[PDB]
Amino acid sequence: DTAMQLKTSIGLITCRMNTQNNQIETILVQKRYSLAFSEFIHCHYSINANQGHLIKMFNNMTINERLLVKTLDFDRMWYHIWIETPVYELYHKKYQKFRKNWLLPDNGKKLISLINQAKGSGTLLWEIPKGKPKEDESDLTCAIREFEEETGITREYYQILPEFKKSMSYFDGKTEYKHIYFLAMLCKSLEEPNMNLSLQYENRIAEISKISWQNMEAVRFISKRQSFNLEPMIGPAFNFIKNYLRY
Amino acid sequence: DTAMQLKTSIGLITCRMNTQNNQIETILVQKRYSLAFSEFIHCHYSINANQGHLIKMFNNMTINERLLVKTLDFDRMWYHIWIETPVYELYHKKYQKFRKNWLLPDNGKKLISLINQAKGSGTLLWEIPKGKPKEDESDLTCAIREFEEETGITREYYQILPEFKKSMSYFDGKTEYKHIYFLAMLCKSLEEPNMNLSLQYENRIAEISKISWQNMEAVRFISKRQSFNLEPMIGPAFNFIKNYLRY
Ligand SMILES: O=P(O)(O)O[C@H]1[C@@H](OP(=O)(O)O)[C@@H](OP(=O)(O)O)[C@@H](OP(=O)(O)O)[C@@H](OP(=O)(O)O)[C@H]1OP(=O)(O)O
Numbered sequence: 001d002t003a004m005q006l007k008t009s010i011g012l013i014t015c016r017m018n019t020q021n022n023q024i025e026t027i028l029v030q031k032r033y034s035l036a037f038s039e040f041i042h043c044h045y046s047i048n049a050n051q052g053h054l055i056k057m058f059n060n061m062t063i064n065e066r067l068l069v070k071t072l073d074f075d076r077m078w079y080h081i082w083i084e085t086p087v088y089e090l091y092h093k094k095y096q097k098f099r100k101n102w103l104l105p106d107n108g109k110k111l112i113s114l115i116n117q118a119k120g121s122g123t124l125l126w127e128i129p130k131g132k133p134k135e136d137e138s139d140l141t142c143a144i145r146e147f148e149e150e151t152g153i154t155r156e157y158y159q160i161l162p163e164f165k166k167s168m169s170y171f172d173g174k175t176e177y178k179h180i181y182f183l184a185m186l187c188k189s190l191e192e193p194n195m196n197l198s199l200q201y202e203n204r205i206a207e208i209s210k211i212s213w214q215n216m217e218a219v220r221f222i223s224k225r226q227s228f229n230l231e232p233m234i235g236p237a238f239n240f241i242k243n244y245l246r247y
Numbered sequence: 248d249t250a251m252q253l254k255t256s257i258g259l260i261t262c263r264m265n266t267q268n269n270q271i272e273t274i275l276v277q278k279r280y281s282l283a284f285s286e287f288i289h290c291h292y293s294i295n296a297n298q299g300h301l302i303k304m305f306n307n308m309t310i311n312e313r314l315l316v317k318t319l320d321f322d323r324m325w326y327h328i329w330i331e332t333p334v335y336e337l338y339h340k341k342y343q344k345f346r347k348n349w350l351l352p353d354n355g356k357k358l359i360s361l362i363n364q365a366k367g368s369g370t371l372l373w374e375i376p377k378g379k380p381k382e383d384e385s386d387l388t389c390a391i392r393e394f395e396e397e398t399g400i401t402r403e404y405y406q407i408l409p410e411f412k413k414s415m416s417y418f419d420g421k422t423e424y425k426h427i428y429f430l431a432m433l434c435k436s437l438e439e440p441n442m443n444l445s446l447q448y449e450n451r452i453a454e455i456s457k458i459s460w461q462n463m464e465a466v467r468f469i470s471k472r473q474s475f476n477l478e479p480m481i482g483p484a485f486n487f488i489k490n491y492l493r494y
């Protein structure tokens with residue numbers, strides 16, 4: 001269709017040879033909150049849409065997120081995503097829409113009824129670390145900065161393998177998403193990447209609940225249980241790793 | 248050692264033949280919060296223990312739980328577990344210990360420092376539904392009541408297979424844990440058990456964030472990534488299912 005928008009993210013696939021099982025593994029990160037929750041809090045829906053449509057949004061939140069919405073306390077909801085990050089003007093605008101959509105019409109009783117009848121729960125995605133380039137930043141510099149910012153793993157732990165680049169395209173209907181991935185190979189021991197997740201590093205925990213080494217079986221297991229398919233990126237990446245090592 | 252206490256839970260392993268892939272599957276439930284968080288909120292630790300010991304407790308919470316503790320708002324912490332369940336006397340006693348341990352000495356700055364330096368995150372367990380028998384309740388009646396209470400699946404969906412009983416024993420050092428499992432076979436279609444999780448059913452969402460059919464590969468995948476090993480119960484259960492069907 002008519003793409004009204006292009007959004008480009010650049011990421012890093014960092015791989016390791018696990019010496020105990022001779023299995024290739026890659027760093028993945030698990031998200032802290034669901035897309036549905038984020039979309040609801042930032043009002044990326046239509047209050048005029050039919051009931052069944054708005055319920056699908058609540059169905060794909062986690063139970064804990066729904067229990068947060070059930071409190072009607074927007075600031076407890078907001079904290080769940082933002083964690084006291086100073087974004088007051090965004091906050092006030094999103095609160096105003098929450099208030100008008102759900103508090104002023106009936107002091108929240110339609111919202112509670114929807115929240116109460118939503119069924120099931122969504123899933124927190126596993127992803128490859130990636131982000132938006134800063135102004136006049138090169139693609140590789142973005143992938144490396146983003147990797148460090150999310151995982152705390154610094155450049156002395158890996159070597160970039162520059163012959164590898166993987167691009168992925170997704171189409172929202174108006175937004176085009178471009179994801180560009182470089183490949184890095186671990187050259188220094190790092191057996192517990194999850195230990196880099198601490199609340200004293202606001203950029204690591206901002207959107208991440210877990211960092212783990214994942215082998216291809218796990219990548220396949222995860223991919224079949226979430227909407228974000230990781231195999232088209234990890235498969236080629238591991239193929240490249242195998243050729244790199246076999247030389 | 249000297250067991251000072253015996254705790255007995257009775258559960259139900261409910262199985263199905265998935266007709267599309269001819270794979271045997273069992274209902275598992277994923278917990279909503281971590282053991283570490285529960286233990287911290289109910290003060291099952293020693294304030295006198297060494298730093299490194301109390302940090303291990305925080306390490307095994309999830310990031311979202313740590314961010315809740317970081318607020319210093321015991322009632323936001325309490326809601327995370329109890330969700331406005333009326334247990335005020337328990338609440339007041341646990342709050343008193345939280346206040347004395349962490350608020351009165353320095354208004355929470357040691358707690359925040361520990362919370363900030365904790366590293367990593369725990370994992371939400373997958374389990375077989377089970378609970379405590381009520382007074383003068385038989386073992387089977389408990390397993391069936393508990394199953395329905397947690398999952399919303401009623402007796403018309405399955406037949407008990409009475410020749411199967413599996414007992415498991417775990418030893419805390421003073422507490423003995425006895426888990427007794429019956430086996431049931433689905434006799435009526437139920438393709439999306441997770442749709443039974445809604446906030447209007449307080450007993451289903453009280454401790455559960457997800458209900459899913461799980462095949463043996465998934466059971467093995469999960470078991471290798473959590474402290475609670477499910478294979479000693481599901482393996483024999485699926486063996487029994489195969490013999491039941493082959494006759
Ligand atoms: O025009 P707006 O609707 O307000 O769009 C803005 C914005 O700045 P400009 O749009 O003024 O250029 C950013 O653009 P980029 O950062 O992509 O350059 C942003 O991106 P982020 O999601 O990375 O913040 C995205 O606009 P874009 O369409 O360029 O992505 C964003 O609107 P969103 O809230 O949709 O991001």
Ligand SMILES: O=P(O)(O)O[C@H]1[C@@H](OP(=O)(O)O)[C@@H](OP(=O)(O)O)[C@@H](OP(=O)(O)O)[C@@H](OP(=O)(O)O)[C@H]1OP(=O)(O)O
Pocket residue numbers: 252253254379
């Ligand atoms: O003696 P307490 O330390 O206060 O023990 C109580 C209690 O009642 P009694 O202990 O007065 O019998 C329950 O006992 P049961 O329900 O097991 O019969 C309970 O069990 P629940 O966890 O199921 O509530 C568990 O005591 P028990 O040692 O019998 O488990 C509980 O202490 P907890 O908080 O450790 O459960």
